Amino acid sequence: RKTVPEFLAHLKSLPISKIASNDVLTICVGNESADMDSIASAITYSYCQYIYNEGTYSEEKKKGSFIVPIIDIPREDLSLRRDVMYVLEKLKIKEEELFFIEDLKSLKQNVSQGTELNSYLVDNNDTPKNLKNYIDNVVGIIDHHFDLQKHLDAEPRIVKVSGSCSSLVFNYWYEKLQGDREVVMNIAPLLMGAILIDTSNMRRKVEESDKLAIERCQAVLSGAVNEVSAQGLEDSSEFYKEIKSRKNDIKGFSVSDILKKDYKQFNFQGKGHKGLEIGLSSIVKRMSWLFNEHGGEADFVNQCRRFQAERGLDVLVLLTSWRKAGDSHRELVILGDSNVVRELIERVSDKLQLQLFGGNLDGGVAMFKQLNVEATRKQVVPYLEEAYSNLEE
């Protein structure tokens, strides 16, 4: 019975021909942000499928090939997620045991040209745009984002409300594995890492899925006990503080690091036949902090413009969020051509309760306090998409 790192090291040890089956190589990939949820969800899916296929649950059922879990960033970028590093360390998962974009490229390359690369999607429900020339078919989906209504024949196809995608993935596999306690012990830090970060320690965004996943982990981690002590929750709380503090730690990173470490890119279609290429970076410190750590406002904005140019963006949006003395705060910063950015912001400013504090929409760079603190990137993107649909051309 291989542990997660043992499973990953086994995959790394195999020829691509023993991973593939009948000229199909199957992967599981999260979204382009490569956050805790995307990483935990992909590894969990792949690992649980492996245990299922090898065990007695899948008797009279059959088939099953390996699924390679993919993290959709360059290998070097992993260390920018200090929370994820901590969680991987708890399970003794080494970076050299993981598969990144470089590895997926090597897989597409070192396999036969006639081999199909099929993907399970977790933590998104359409293929990441950067992988659309690598992935031939989507074969299953487990996600908790807005349903784009693609790949309707996917098996499974779970797109449902959840604090964490990881909860949905775990509960799906837990049922198939008949609650296999060893699997639960072997994945718990990864699963709980995602659930607890995504729900702020089961205090926000909680759904039935997350409650059930947590209940299941608690039962296993406690073991046989005559009564339930406070220790389990105390341990979860200490674990949460470690992961949260590390997610909140971007000291020592470059501006480019900060912009790329929790980043999503979209192309909006409008009335015009050329869409809008837009990138949104989610950041855990406020603009004044970022300026102070990066040589001041001018230097920081220069680095943002460089990032925008490098990624081919019409518009770059920075979304900051933080907590101090119990209260949430957010900011929204936009960089782009003055015409497009003015129109976009004027159309979302009421909903997002935006208040200008720096720059000028007419200059193409403007900075806003966002008093709608409930609106995350998941909400801001559709608002901007709708705003863009109303622009003329």
Preceding omega of 74 cis (within 30 degrees of 0): no
Q: Give CA–CA dist 181/161, Å, rounded.
A: 26
Say which DSSP state 390 is in: T
Part of the chain binding Co ion (CB under 5 A), chosen from 35-43, 68-76, 97-105, 358-366: 35-43
Cα–Cα nearest to 219, from 235, 234, 232, 200: 232
Nearer to Co ion, 101 or 165 (CB): 165
Least Å distance, CB 37 to Co ion, is 3
CA 220 to mean position of chain CA atoms: 26
CB of 382 to Co ion, least distance (A): 15
Q: How far is the CB of 28 from Co ion (least distance, A)?
A: 14
Q: Stretches 129-137, 157-165, 201-209, 218-226: which one binds Co ion (CB under 5 A)? A: 157-165
Residue 31: CB minimum distance to Co ion, A: 7
37/331 with CB nearer Co ion:
37
> Residues at the annotated binding site for ATP?
145, 282, 377
> Minimum CB separation from Co ion for residue 34, in Å?
10
Cα 277-280-285 angle, rounded to 5 deg: 160
Coil, helix or strand at residue 249: coil
- Residue 165 contacts Co ion per CB under 5 A: yes
User: In the complex, what is the shortest distance from the CB of residue 123 to Co ion, in angstroms, rounded to a whole number?
Assistant: 4
DSSP labels, 128-190: -GGGTTT--EEEEEEE-S------TT-SSEEE---S-HHHHHHHHHHHHTTT-HHHHHHHHHH
Nearer to Co ion, 11 or 70 (CB): 70
Of 142 and 165, CB closest to Co ion? 165
Our CB check for Co ion shows the closer of 72 and 180 to be 72
Q: Which of residues 90-129 bind Co ion (CB under 5 A)?
A: 123
| Nearest distance, CB of residue 161 and Co ion, angstroms | 11
Q: Which one, 37 or 314, has the nearer CB to Co ion? A: 37
Q: How far is CA 386 from CA 59, 153, 212, 228, 355, in A?
A: 49, 28, 35, 50, 20
Q: Minimum distance between the CB of residue 140 and Co ion, rounded to whole angstroms?
A: 16
CA atoms within a 13 Å half-sphere pointing along the CA-CB vector of 32: 16
Q: Among 7, 20, 28, 37, which residue sits at the site for Co ion (rule: CB under 5 A)?
A: 37
Annotated binding site for Mn(2+): 37, 123, 144
The binding site consists of 37, 123, 144-145, 282, 377
128 Cβ partners below 8 Å, 6+ apart?
29, 31, 32, 72
In what order do the strands lie in the sheet containing 116-122?
A: 68-70, 24-29, 116-122, 137-143, 157-159
Is the CB of 37 or the CB of 180 nearer to Co ion? Answer: 37
Distances in Å between the Cα of 312 and the Cα atoms of 15, 72, 322 are 37, 19, 29
Query: Residues marked as binding for Mg(2+)?
Result: 37, 123, 144
Query: Whose Cβ is closer to Co ion: residue 108's or residue 261's?
Result: 261
Q: Which value, to the nearest 10 degrees, does the dihedral of the CA atoms of residues 57, 58, 64, 70 take?
A: -10
User: Within a 10 A sphere around the Cβ of 133, how many other Cβ atoms?
Assistant: 9
Q: At what angle do helices 181-198 and 208-222 cross, to 10 degrees?
A: 130
Size of the site for Co ion (CB under 5 A): 3
Binding site for Co ion (CB under 5 A): 37, 123, 165
